[PDB]
Design a protein around this ligand. Structure first.
Ligand SMILES: NC(=O)c1ccc[n+]([C@@H]2O[C@H](COP(=O)([O-])OP(=O)(O)OC[C@H]3O[C@@H](n4cnc5c(N)ncnc54)[C@H](OP(=O)(O)O)[C@@H]3O)[C@@H](O)[C@H]2O)c1
Length: 316
């Protein structure tokens, strides 16, 4: 099991990253520092998570302590939907570089394929609770992302929550300069993404699995929702290998040649989640876990189901 995966730009991406969604500002700085001390070399971020400054502080501290060099870190961020307009993309990236205190990003993703009306609101809603979309399309935005690569501001560009038709639009774009290196998508035993994974890997596109633990801290969780961490079937697989349920959940996407970005702001869990290179799930274990699929999404973007570019109407 290699700890990194070769990307289609030539760079190697560490297959284990720290997620930072819902990491509060007054705790994410310590989280990132503990991550780096423990051995994480991949931090996944986004403007919309409202904590990039605080991630920036932590990276800078560890660079100045000389625990890591910058070229050893792989730092990812995402362009939020309100900045899909072509002329706003660079501004958005620069705002993120400035908060992270970096001169370059290793990877910059289009966060969602849906463009929202520009402004102060992250989710500019209408009367009905539906997002006001921007008069934008995916191809023009991709063109703006490509300029970021040409300027050296980002080493790789990518997409997140794109379906295979949307990825295909980019790949078939007239005058394409850069293929996306990565598709970042929800993926866990309840949403196993077999068809999207097969498509992406066949196109040389690396897949990053998000919400690998089932995002137990998600703000909209309901008591009826299934719970990966509490599944006694997954607990027995963990008990079998003398590991924890979270460790099994993290390791699972790794053996599928995926990148995985579990989130924690608890030092002890940050360390636990890292200890996933010392065991192996069996073939039987993998087939078992794959059979738990139930097309269940944490992030279904339900305010945008009328948006022309809503990703999740299509099968995959
Ligand atoms: N591209 C997108 O649209 C998108 C969408 C969603 C997520 N993501 C990315 O993927 C990252 C992870 O997804 P996620 O944050 O939704 O949820 P997740 O990583 O599946 O789960 C986070 C929850 O798991 C808990 N946890 C972590 N390790 C644990 C352990 N060993 N034992 C018990 N509980 C543990 C955390 O608690 P504590 O924090 O209290 O320790 C937190 O509440 C996100 O942070 C973000 O970077 C991207």
């Amino acid at each position: 099991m290699a700890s990194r995966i070769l990307l289609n730009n030539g760079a190697k991406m560490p297959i284990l990253g720290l997620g930072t969604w819902k990491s509060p500002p007054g705790q994410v700085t310590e989280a990132v520092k503990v991550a780096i001390d423990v051995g994480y070399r991949h931090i996944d971020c986004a403007h919309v998570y409202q904590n990039e400054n605080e991630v920036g502080v932590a990276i800078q501290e560890k660079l100045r302590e000389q625990v890591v060099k910058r070229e050893e870190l792989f730092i990812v961020s995402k362009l939020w939907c309100t900045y899909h307009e072509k002329g706003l993309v660079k501004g958005a990236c620069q705002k993120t570089l400035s908060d992270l205190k970096l001169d370059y990003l290793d990877l910059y993703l289009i966060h969602w394929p849906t463009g929202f009306k520009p402004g102060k609101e992250f989710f500019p809603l209408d009367e009905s609770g539906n997002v006001v979309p921007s008069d934008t399309n995916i191809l023009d935005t991709w063109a703006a992302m490509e300029e970021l690569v040409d300027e050296g501001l980002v080493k790789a560009i990518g997409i997140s929550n794109f379906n295979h038709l949307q990825v295909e639009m980019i790949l078939n774009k007239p005058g394409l300069k850069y293929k996306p290196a990565v598709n970042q998508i929800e993926c866990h035993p309840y949403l196993t993404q077999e068809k999207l994974i097969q498509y992406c890997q066949s196109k040389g596109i690396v897949v990053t699995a998000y919400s690998p633990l089932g995002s137990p801290d998600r703000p909209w969780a309901k008591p009826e929702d299934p719970s990966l961490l509490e599944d006694p079937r997954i607990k027995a697989i963990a008990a079998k290998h003398n590991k924890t349920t979270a460790q099994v959940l993290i390791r699972f996407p790794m053996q599928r040649n995926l990148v995985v970005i579990p989130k924690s702001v608890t030092p002890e869990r940050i360390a636990e989640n890292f200890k996933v290179f010392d065991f192996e799930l069996s073939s039987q274990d993998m087939t078992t876990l794959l059979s738990y699929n139930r097309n269940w999404r944490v992030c279904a973007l339900l305010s945008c189901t009328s948006h022309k570019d809503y990703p999740f109407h299509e099968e995959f």
